């Protein structure tokens, strides 16, 4: 019956004020909640504890830009002058006591997007299949893409200037710890295909601009 409901996503412009909402039940309008921040490759961090009376004690290592407010059944997480490194999943939590039994409900989490960051074209590294892999009758090309923003790229593979889609696996762009994005693409080949051509290419398209690396058998 104890329910924490929050929105799934929210976008804000760079340097603007941001407000995240967490709504408790009507039978639980009195309760104190906590805010947690979930960043990739990291332990969820304690942001602040927010009581109904409006009092709030921030967590160790939390900027002055973070605020909290109580209104009726709503609990707010305010961020003034929102910075790129505030891109995370913000999760609200609430505690209670029924019987001796302990109860703790987490909200669904809100994914906050910070827009208006400077554009950055991707860096591209392309690796040929290794000699040991070719021995094992396998061949994979590795295209590594990094340091781009926004986090949307298109990868196209070519064999001697002619497109390949047959054995391509590409990741979703993911946030680096420098607030830019990374991604990788693998083209699988037989040793025969790899040898029968003069070169292979990985072409990365990002916001209308293109970066291409080429690799060749030796």
């Amino acid at each position: 019956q104890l329910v924490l409901t929050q929105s799934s996503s929210a976008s804000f412009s760079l340097g603007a004020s941001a407000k995240l909402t967490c709504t408790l039940s009507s039978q639980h309008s009195t309760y104190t909640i906590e805010w947690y921040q979930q960043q990739p490759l990291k332990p969820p961090k304690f942001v602040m504890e927010l009581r109904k009376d409006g009092s709030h004690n921030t967590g160790d290592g939390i900027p002055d830009r973070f605020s909290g407010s109580s209104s009726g059944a709503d609990r707010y997480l305010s961020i003034s002058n929102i910075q790129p490194e505030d891109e995370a999943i913000y999760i609200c939590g609430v505690g209670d006591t029924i019987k001796e039994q302990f109860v703790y409900v987490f909200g669904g989490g809100t994914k906050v997007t910070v827009l208006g960051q400077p554009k950055a074209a991707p860096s591209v590294t392309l690796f040929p299949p290794s000699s040991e892999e070719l021995q094992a009758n396998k061949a994979t090309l590795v295209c590594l893409i990094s340091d781009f923003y926004p986090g949307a790229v298109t990868v196209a593979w070519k064999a001697d200037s002619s497109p390949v889609k047959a054995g391509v696996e590409t990741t979703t762009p993911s946030k680096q710890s420098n607030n830019k994005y990374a991604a990788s693409s693998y083209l699988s080949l037989t040793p025969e295909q790899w040898k029968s051509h003069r070169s292979y290419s990985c072409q990365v398209t990002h916001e209308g601009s293109t970066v291409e690396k080429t690799v060749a058998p030796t």
């Binding site: 947690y36 332990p43 304690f46 939590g93 001796e100 290794s130 892999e133 990788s184």
Partner: protein
């Protein structure tokens, strides 16, 4: 001032698994220790908790009876005994301390409950191609399940290291790459070794990367 978990891994449905959590940077009986998990696709869920003196113990109704929590004060370690494991227990399990709020969390450890067979990765060096800066790496191919750990030179190298998120291929197997970006002149003075560890398949490999 950090927390560190262990014991995670892949187990078949119905079997057992023990998780541990070592504490450091603060005293022992000052906080209650809790376990919080996050299953794929779902939000955070409180699992179990034990008081500062092991007086009170809590269990989610989802893990009622099947789970057993206990505390140690000597090595400052808490434990979670997981019996009668089901597929639904598949999650990242975090340990966290609490005096009212979960103010500090551990890195988390992955527990997979599945009928799927473990598979160890093949590890291939990605050699520097023939200035100023050079990229080299290790391809870690076709493994299951997550995670694998990659380091360089037994942890002595972290500068310029970028380990990429895994791709999950249509085959159901994972594959990732780790690359270091180094000055070209270091290629002749520095030995570069990738340390790959895939615990579930007992696969621990140190591969030399050379031009």
């Amino acid at each position: 001032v950090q927390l560190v978990e262990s014991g995670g891994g892949l187990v078949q449905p119905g079997r057992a698994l023990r998780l541990s959590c070592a504490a450091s940077g603060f005293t022992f009986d000052d906080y209650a220790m809790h376990w919080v998990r996050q299953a794929p696709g779902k939000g955070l869920e409180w699992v179990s908790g034990i008081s500062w003196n092991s007086g009170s113990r809590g269990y989610a109704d989802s893990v009622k009876g099947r789970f057993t929590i206990s505390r140690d004060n000597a090595k400052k370690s808490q434990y979670l005994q997981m019996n009668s494991l089901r597929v639904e227990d598949t999650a990242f399990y975090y340990c966290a301390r609490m005096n009212g709020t979960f103010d500090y969390w551990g890195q988390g450890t992955l527990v997979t409950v599945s009928l799927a067979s473990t598979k160890g990765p093949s590890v291939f060096p990605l050699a520097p191609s023939s200035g100023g800066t050079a990229a080299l790496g290790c391809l870690v191919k076709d493994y299951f399940p997550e995670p694998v750990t990659v380091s360089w030179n037994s942890g002595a190298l972290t500068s310029g290291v970028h380990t990429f998120p895994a791709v999950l291929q249509s085959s159901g197997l994972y594959s990732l790459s780790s690359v270091v970006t180094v000055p070209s002149s270091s290629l002749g003075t520095q030995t570069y070794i990738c340390n790959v560890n895939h615990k579930p398949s007992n696969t621990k490999v140190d591969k030399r990367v050379e031009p």
